[PDB]
């Protein structure tokens, strides 16, 4: 009654950490949506071969002041913009680019000091299910990477400060929460014995079957 | 007129609310039937998986961890034995039933064991499979193992024995008789052991696995 | 008049009007070994002019006694009701009062606030542990606080009648019979690891007699486990 | 269109709202029947508890606080007496009825007292149990106590007397006759007194107990 | 009509006091959930042997500035995280540990200047009732503490500042409110006569039965 795949795969799990500054070398965040970065969620999803689900992206944006020597700093409420890029969408090369105005990318505006912004994404795969394990080459004629089918693409996420708050520097952080909804699974497979190495593939280092003991009769 | 109660304007991670869809009026691609649709984890824990009973020394880093050696020469001598705790015990650690259990805190249900003698057809003998309940320690001699719950397994007739265990206890195997083989047949055989959930099996309080690093 | 009650092979002699006080309006029942249903008569304890009190732990009281001791040994967990009979035979020229009470989960305090007491000092096997009048010294000892006006649990002894009790007044009454249901949060529990009920007997009004009478009154306690089942 | 009224966004400690459950879809463990389920505090205040009537000097630090001494030699002499205020009076302070009352401010109901003579069977005598209503002070002589509400209690016949008190007043006990005993029987006896709530008993305005430190 | 166990055991009672700083030696709070610290609630609960109830945890988090000699301090809205640890859950060894991201521990995020955050907890005991008074040893083979059954465990609570507000130091406090809900009780027992000594056990110092008077007839 509790071990259903729903109650087993419907937990809000943080999947990203990054920072962007109102003024500075880094002024915007970018992260291609993937459930492979977080090992805790990756290992839970690698129980099944084919999986299909919806998302509920919920962000947590916090701002902290920086150690600067400018005086007479008067802060104004900060506004953050989070542009979701659909697969094949234009990606902002810079912070003040024109792509931040395309009516296709559904950006959500947020003003500091409110309930954290949340949006949902449907099943975007052209195929009929996201495939965790692919046993082929993405390119039709081959000469393409192994096990890298583009059917699982889920788009990219971009975030920036719409308005600089004060003359003094401000650095903000954003934590992206992943919540699969209406989950379905197919073809159960064995749990990953060895520890993960690269999020890109299934490469691993050989590991023993289990912890050893003194004698068989003990 | 409305009033905002405490608990408003908070992001309680474990809550189920309606969420504003980002891309509405978008088609979904109808789902085809794919063979084999899991609906409950239990259906996975009902599949027998081989057990590395002999996880002694460098056996874990080889295929010889799953086979239990049964020699011809040496009575009261013991074949194997391991404590019956599918959760914390190193034997049932990475078993299909064990891994699933490492995701939960509470669990109640029967455990089914199955031993498959993998020896020459001519090879014959008898074995004493004794299960001591929780409070009692593992038996020391063959008589003490006989006086409890036991199953005398005759390899000559039956090749596979099944043990259903209620409600940790111990499992011990003894040589009732040495292996008897006609000439031109090897006397050194092996035994394999599968584990599986049986009858009612419930799991409560989902937690994180301790095998991640 | 007198009457005889037989359980298994043992027999007890009691009056016609015994005035039984059921535990909490419930009679012991199986959860939904008959050979363990006998009258395990413990020892008698001489009640004197200065005796502070006594207390027994029912599971422990029957740990060494025959079938009950053998059963609670190999068997893991289980449950058991009880029917404690306290018989106190004294003359007509004697006078005094007793409070017979069965206290469930009676956790007892330790003389040294810093640590808990030891098992031997807390549990009296095949004998009855007794209270004391003066306070127990607070040193570096794992002793149990045996003050009688606090009963050890830490509460005023007067209001110890909330628990299923019964008063023996040597003026009118002579004995008490208390039926006790199995009270535990867990359906079945290891009898050796945890004791569910404590029988306490306290002489509020002291014994007194003229010179030339029996120097003591021999209280007698009889336990009979009702509806005992094991796993 | 909504408007937020005053009283919104406040944590009023004593309020009953719906609360977002932290761990949802978690099982609860079905409740077994445990013998003896309290539903109302009153059922506790209906149990007789012995009273430390003689809380004089170092008696409180001994078991001799509960017994009332009744001597053979000395008529108009008085046995005991205490004011009938179960709340503030030191006699009914730590009684089961009194402790429960110390948790409330207002209360209305009858009080039941019960005296149990704990003396030798041969011992015989008579006692005058007189209850003076609120406005009047405690009586001084035996005649004045007789002329009010009284109960002549004969220990030789009845061994326990019950007094039901309406609506503080006073309770006084007098020796109608000295204790008469045949030879070989002690003449110094004792009396015990139980207190209990009777008939209607209500308690209003829950407050903190004054016995905490 | 008023003396029911519900109306007698359903009062919001503060049970904890602690402080954590944005920067400093103490940067996070921790308190194992127990109804034994508050004597007012402990003495009320020790009326009954077996008790079962639900909780309604409501916190009150207030922040105050500190006496520092840094200038040009510009504060940003503070966000606090409160991670509830279920029994047997991983416990953060440090403030910036990875355990603060486990999807199991249900942490609630809160931004200063809103209605105080509140969450509820069901009956978590494996047994069928919380037992106030245990008369045994927790360890099955004994050689274990007396009267310390682990059946009453209710988990731990952790709290931290997700984002430092300003360069200048800030110290925050948190008061945890306990509200038992849907209360049931069993086996009434006498009120504790002597004052409490250690929250760990029932050890006490012997005390007189009551206050003394002049004479018995007075």
UniProtKB/Swiss-Prot annotation, chains A, E:
Compartments, as annotated in UniProt: Virion; Host cytoplasm
Subunit and partners: Interacts with capsid protein VP0, and capsid protein VP3 to form heterotrimeric protomers. Five protomers subsequently associate to form pentamers which serve as building blocks for the capsid. Interacts with capsid protein VP2, capsid protein VP3 and capsid protein VP4 following cleavage of capsid protein VP0. Interacts with host CD55. Interacts with host CXADR.
Function noted in UniProt: Forms an icosahedral capsid of pseudo T=3 symmetry with capsid proteins VP2 and VP3. The capsid is 300 Angstroms in diameter, composed of 60 copies of each capsid protein and enclosing the viral positive strand RNA genome. Capsid protein VP1 mainly forms the vertices of the capsid. Capsid protein VP1 interacts with host CD55 and CXADR to provide virion attachment to target host cells. This attachment induces virion internalization. Tyrosine kinases are probably involved in the entry process. After binding to its receptor, the capsid undergoes conformational changes.
Protein name in UniProt: Capsid protein VP1
Originating species: Coxsackievirus B3 (strain Nancy)
Taxonomic placement: Viruses, Riboviria, Orthornavirae, Pisuviricota, Pisoniviricetes
Interval of the full protein contained in this chain: 630 to 847 of 2185
From Swiss-Prot, chains B, D:
Transmembrane domains' residue ranges: none
Name of the featured protein: Capsid protein VP3
Top-rank taxon, per record: Viruses
Function: Forms an icosahedral capsid of pseudo T=3 symmetry with capsid proteins VP2 and VP3. The capsid is 300 Angstroms in diameter, composed of 60 copies of each capsid protein and enclosing the viral positive strand RNA genome.
Localization, UniProt: Virion; Host cytoplasm
Residues of the full protein shown: 335 to 564 of 2185
Signal peptide: none
Oligomer status and interactors: Interacts with capsid protein VP0 and capsid protein VP1 to form heterotrimeric protomers. Five protomers subsequently associate to form pentamers which serve as building blocks for the capsid. Interacts with capsid protein VP4 in the mature capsid. Interacts with protein 2C; this interaction may be important for virion morphogenesis.
